Amino acid sequence: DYMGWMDF
Amino acid sequence: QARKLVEQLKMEANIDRIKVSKAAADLMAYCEAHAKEDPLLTPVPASENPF
Amino acid sequence: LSAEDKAAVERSKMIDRNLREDGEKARRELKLLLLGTGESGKSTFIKQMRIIHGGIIEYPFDLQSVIFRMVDVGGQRSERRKWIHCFENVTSIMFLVALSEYDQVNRMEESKALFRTIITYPWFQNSSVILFLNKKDLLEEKIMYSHLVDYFPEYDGPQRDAQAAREFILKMFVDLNPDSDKIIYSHFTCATDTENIRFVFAAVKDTILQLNLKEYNLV
Amino acid sequence: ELDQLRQEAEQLKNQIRDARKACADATLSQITNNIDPVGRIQMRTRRTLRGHLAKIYAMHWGTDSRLLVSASQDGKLIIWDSYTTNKVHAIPLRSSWVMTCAYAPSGNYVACGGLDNICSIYNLKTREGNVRVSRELAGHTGYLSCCRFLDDNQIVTSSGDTTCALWDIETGQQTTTFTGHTGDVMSLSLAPDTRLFVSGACDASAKLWDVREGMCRQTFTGHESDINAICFFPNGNAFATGSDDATCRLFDLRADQELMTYSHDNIICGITSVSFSKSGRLLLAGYDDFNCNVWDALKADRAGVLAGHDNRVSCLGVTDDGMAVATGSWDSFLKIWN
Amino acid sequence: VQLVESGGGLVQPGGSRKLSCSASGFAFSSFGMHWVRQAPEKGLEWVAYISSGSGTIYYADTVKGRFTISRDDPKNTLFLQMTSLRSEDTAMYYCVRSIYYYGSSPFDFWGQGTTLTVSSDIVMTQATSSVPVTPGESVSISCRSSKSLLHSNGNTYLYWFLQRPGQSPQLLIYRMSNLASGVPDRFSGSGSGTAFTLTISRLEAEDVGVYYCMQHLEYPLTFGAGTKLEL
Amino acid sequence: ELAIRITLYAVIFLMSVGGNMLIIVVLGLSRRLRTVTNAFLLSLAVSDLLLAVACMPFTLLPNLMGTFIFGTVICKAVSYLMGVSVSVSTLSLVAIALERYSAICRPLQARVWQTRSHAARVIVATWLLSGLLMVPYPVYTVVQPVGPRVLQCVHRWPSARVRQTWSVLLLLLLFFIPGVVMAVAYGLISRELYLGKLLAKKRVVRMLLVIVVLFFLCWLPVYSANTWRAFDGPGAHRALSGAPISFIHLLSYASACVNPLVYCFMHRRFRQACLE
Numbered sequence A: 001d002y003m004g005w006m007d008f
Numbered sequence B: 001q002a003r004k005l006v007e008q009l010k011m012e013a014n015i016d017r018i019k020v021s022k023a024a025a026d027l028m029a030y031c032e033a034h035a036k037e038d039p040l041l042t043p044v045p046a047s048e049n050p051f
Numbered sequence C: 001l002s003a004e005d006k007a008a009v010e011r012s013k014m015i016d017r018n019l020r021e022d023g024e025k026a027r028r029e030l031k032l033l034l035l036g037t038g039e040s041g042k043s044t045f046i047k048q049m050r051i052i053h054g055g056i057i058e059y060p061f062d063l064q065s066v067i068f069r070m071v072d073v074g075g076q077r078s079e080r081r082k083w084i085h086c087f088e089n090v091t092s093i094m095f096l097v098a099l100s101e102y103d104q105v106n107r108m109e110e111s112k113a114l115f116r117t118i119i120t121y122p123w124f125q126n127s128s129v130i131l132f133l134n135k136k137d138l139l140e141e142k143i144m145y146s147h148l149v150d151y152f153p154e155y156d157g158p159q160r161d162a163q164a165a166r167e168f169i170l171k172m173f174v175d176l177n178p179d180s181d182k183i184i185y186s187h188f189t190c191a192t193d194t195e196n197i198r199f200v201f202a203a204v205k206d207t208i209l210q211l212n213l214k215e216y217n218l219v
Numbered sequence D: 001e002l003d004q005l006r007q008e009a010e011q012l013k014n015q016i017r018d019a020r021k022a023c024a025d026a027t028l029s030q031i032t033n034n035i036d037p038v039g040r041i042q043m044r045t046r047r048t049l050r051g052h053l054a055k056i057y058a059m060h061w062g063t064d065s066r067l068l069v070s071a072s073q074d075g076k077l078i079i080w081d082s083y084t085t086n087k088v089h090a091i092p093l094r095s096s097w098v099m100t101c102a103y104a105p106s107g108n109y110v111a112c113g114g115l116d117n118i119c120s121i122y123n124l125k126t127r128e129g130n131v132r133v134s135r136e137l138a139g140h141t142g143y144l145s146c147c148r149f150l151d152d153n154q155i156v157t158s159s160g161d162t163t164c165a166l167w168d169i170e171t172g173q174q175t176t177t178f179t180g181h182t183g184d185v186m187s188l189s190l191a192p193d194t195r196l197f198v199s200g201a202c203d204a205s206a207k208l209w210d211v212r213e214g215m216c217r218q219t220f221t222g223h224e225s226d227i228n229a230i231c232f233f234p235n236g237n238a239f240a241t242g243s244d245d246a247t248c249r250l251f252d253l254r255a256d257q258e259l260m261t262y263s264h265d266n267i268i269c270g271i272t273s274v275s276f277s278k279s280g281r282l283l284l285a286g287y288d289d290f291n292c293n294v295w296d297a298l299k300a301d302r303a304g305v306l307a308g309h310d311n312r313v314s315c316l317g318v319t320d321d322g323m324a325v326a327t328g329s330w331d332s333f334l335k336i337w338n
Numbered sequence E: 001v002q003l004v005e006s007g008g009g010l011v012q013p014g015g016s017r018k019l020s021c022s023a024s025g026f027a028f029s030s031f032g033m034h035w036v037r038q039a040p041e042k043g044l045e046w047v048a049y050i051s052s053g054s055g056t057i058y059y060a061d062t063v064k065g066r067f068t069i070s071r072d073d074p075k076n077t078l079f080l081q082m083t084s085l086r087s088e089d090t091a092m093y094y095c096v097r098s099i100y101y102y103g104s105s106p107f108d109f110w111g112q113g114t115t116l117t118v119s120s121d122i123v124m125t126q127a128t129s130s131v132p133v134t135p136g137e138s139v140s141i142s143c144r145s146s147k148s149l150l151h152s153n154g155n156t157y158l159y160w161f162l163q164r165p166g167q168s169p170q171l172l173i174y175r176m177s178n179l180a181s182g183v184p185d186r187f188s189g190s191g192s193g194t195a196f197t198l199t200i201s202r203l204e205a206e207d208v209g210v211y212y213c214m215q216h217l218e219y220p221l222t223f224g225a226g227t228k229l230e231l
Numbered sequence F: 001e002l003a004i005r006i007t008l009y010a011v012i013f014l015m016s017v018g019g020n021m022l023i024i025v026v027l028g029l030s031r032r033l034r035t036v037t038n039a040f041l042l043s044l045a046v047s048d049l050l051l052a053v054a055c056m057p058f059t060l061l062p063n064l065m066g067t068f069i070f071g072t073v074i075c076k077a078v079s080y081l082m083g084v085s086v087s088v089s090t091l092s093l094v095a096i097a098l099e100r101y102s103a104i105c106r107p108l109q110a111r112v113w114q115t116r117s118h119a120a121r122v123i124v125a126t127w128l129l130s131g132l133l134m135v136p137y138p139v140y141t142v143v144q145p146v147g148p149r150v151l152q153c154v155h156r157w158p159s160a161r162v163r164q165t166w167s168v169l170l171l172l173l174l175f176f177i178p179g180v181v182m183a184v185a186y187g188l189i190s191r192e193l194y195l196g197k198l199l200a201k202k203r204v205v206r207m208l209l210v211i212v213v214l215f216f217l218c219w220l221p222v223y224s225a226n227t228w229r230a231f232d233g234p235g236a237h238r239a240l241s242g243a244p245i246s247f248i249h250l251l252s253y254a255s256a257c258v259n260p261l262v263y264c265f266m267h268r269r270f271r272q273a274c275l276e
Helices: B003-013 B020-033 C003-028 C043-051 C107-119 C137-142 C164-174 C196-215 D002-022 F003-029 F036-055 F057-064 F071-105 F107-111 F116-133 F163-195 F198-232 F234-239 F244-263 F270-275
Strands: C030-036 C056-063 C066-073 C092-098 C128-134 D045-049 D056-061 D067-072 D076-081 D086-092 D098-103 D109-114 D119-123 D132-137 D144-149 D154-159 D164-168 D174-178 D185-190 D196-201 D205-210 D216-220 D227-232 D238-243 D248-252 D257-262 D271-276 D282-287 D292-296 D302-306 D313-318 D325-329 D334-337 E002-006 E009-011 E017-024 E032-038 E044-050 E057-059 E067-072 E077-082 E094-098 E116-118 E130-132 E139-144 E158-163 E170-174 E187-192 E195-200 E210-215 E227-230
Touching (some): C092 C107, C107 C164, C128 C164, D056 D325, D067 D098, D205 D227, E044 E067, F036 F116, F163 F198
Parallel strands (some): D056 D313, D185 D227, E130 E227
Antiparallel strands (some): D154 D164, D205 D216, D227 D238, D238 D248, D313 D325, E044 E057
């Protein structure tokens, strides 16, 4: 999974 | 113009002079006699300084 | 602190506030140094400038929310080597030469030497030069029967009334600059000419703009 | 005849040279061989007076060794209280070109001059709580390089028109005019008894003038360039000249010739200010390297360095009691070393 | 160098009032101002103080809260707004100027004042009520302070004022040792901590009056009781 | 694969941190470089060092390890630091552009107030406004695991119309207005330079164009992705989660390597650096 993406 | 320089040279020519050793001795004597009260040469303690 | 010492510190703080105010007020204004040569006619020059809605002397010019001060060192027997370091922060020098004096004995070579010495001083490295070549009409009237081919060495141009004399004199006076760092804002001023103040304003604005380009990492 | 003048001048100059060379028994350096050197002396900035917004061209101490005036090119004459780092007065000038400044011995008046050829005299102690221009002495035709109060009613000035003058403040006109120099007159210093004074000129010469009589007494010429600064030994029989060849020199009046020279191969720039200590052992000398030096007057060996300033040090002064040394530089900061 | 007071008159108890002092001849914007009152037959007592630029204002505790002080620098005036005038404010107020820098003489110039009719602290005392004086003979006045006036910087803040009959008092000596300007050299002052003396030599005319000693330490500026030299 | 990714990350990390510390130590310990633009460049270098140190590892390591082990406090602190430093860098670039415009287009009228005190006031106001603006990051940054051991530290915004509103607000206030302001200001500067050695002027214009196009190219993908994300959610996450968003943030952090090279380490100023 892990959608990640913790905006900059 | 020209006479003034000669007159001043004649004035300065006949002047009294002393030996250099005498001037040096008197200079050293003055430097020594007043050496105690010279806060720059022999600094005073921190109590006497106004700064 | 005793009762009297606190009031002394308050007076000192007021003094320092007034000093800061006057310091900013004097930071607004700019200073130019006008350096006339021998019999170059800089009295009528300043008169003409001041008349059209413009001991050491200072003439202030209020130009569009900017205040210039034309510091003029009129009478000094002091060989210029001792007091010139006072003018280390001047924005631009204003060197006034005369065009009709290439015959008088020559005087033009003396003006060139003076220009070179003043321009080679180490104090003026962050200040431009504004070259004013006064007495143009008298040169137009005087270029006949003069034939500066014998006064000056080459003057390869025609021995006539052509304006190649003006350009040759300007090339003589420009080629004395240490090259590629300082720019000379030449100008040909007549006895009756209104555009002097506008040209001074333009040259000072350009000098400040170039210094700002240099200082703001933009070049 | 015109040639007779030159002949007499050459003959008399050779006579004076041979005379002053005849009375030369031994140098000052030899007689001072058996003297314990002062070693090394370190000084730290106790104060820092920061109210000027431009270069500092002059500075003088008051006779109480507490107050001091300073003149800056921002058209200001500030009277600091050195002890607590206060400001007592901030006189605004008429012409912002000042090259000298003085403080009266009684503490009443101050004076300043510059490129306006005028010496203005301000009266501090008065009613109305205002500092107003008492008088304006305008007789010179060149920049005023130095001015020193003699009394409350007499002042000595030196200008760039190769002339010195003695003014009576009450009337306002020159009572005596000293005209012996060929070049400009850069500095000036009064005797401890104010009966004589010397002036250093741009033609590499100092002259000794008698205030009462009004004529040049002696003429010393040892330097190789212009003499920027001059001061008196506290005894009154010797003086020191700083020049632009990076060499201070010490002359004596009675011997009528140069005694000592203080030259180091490191320093090359000129000398802006020179002063003595209270006893006459130290010799403070400002330089263009932005650092003072402390020479040993008798041994001619450097004994310290005062490197605190960022730009050339233009003025330097020593209190009457010798308690401190003020130095002012071209960065609007004058510091009090002790 | 002239102060002129304006105001006063008869006032019912509790009413408000204003006093206006006009200052002409000096740089009023550079002088701190004091309002110092005087009872019908008693001595002087300090009421209010406003420095140069209005940056610092002080009052006495007997007038704190019901008094307001202000200044108008362009018009060169000093204003004292009084509220709820009690029966103890029937006094002839004076306005004093003073400038504080190294070597200055504060409280140097007093001015004439108006007369109203309203129908801790260093208690300085001068036990000598009246001293007999003969013209040409040296006389002395003694003033005693509660605590030591000698400060750390060696400046003992003691002032001496002389009030002639029917006039405003003037500054004789400031900091107990320095003679004020315009005062004959016959006056002198010398003393130690808490015990100060004023010496007059060869007493001359126009010297009959009252003498007050004032301290300048904590700003409830307290005056002395006063000594009257009667012939 | 992933070797080139971590390679570029290490390269930009070392370059950013080194250039930034060099500029800070030089411009702080020079004592003579106290111009009006050097204050802005010092603020930019400090915020850029903070950008590198805060954002780069706490974005890379949680992306490789598959989980975010660092915890709630660390996640909150890193999110606040990211949000503060990005906006500080952007506003500092805009402030430098406006100062250059005022200094080059109207030199006399701007000579009045362009002093170092104004620079310090503007810098502290920029930092204060950024710190006041970027508090909703940490406040809404909880740590929630979707599955056994992921912990997937993300921003759980309160509800709808809060993701969208905040995303559009950030986009407009930090990409549109700053980008347009910089472009207009530098276009005007280029015009007043074109009015009147021609080489230097055209090289200056080339450098200004490089600056503008680099800012746009760098900070476009990162904001566009958020517009897709805060709006749609699963579509965007499904679209680019593992590999592409890492390269997008690499492009973002490439500004940390670009700013010092184009602002400080050129223009022969590095003579003072090597002299130091």
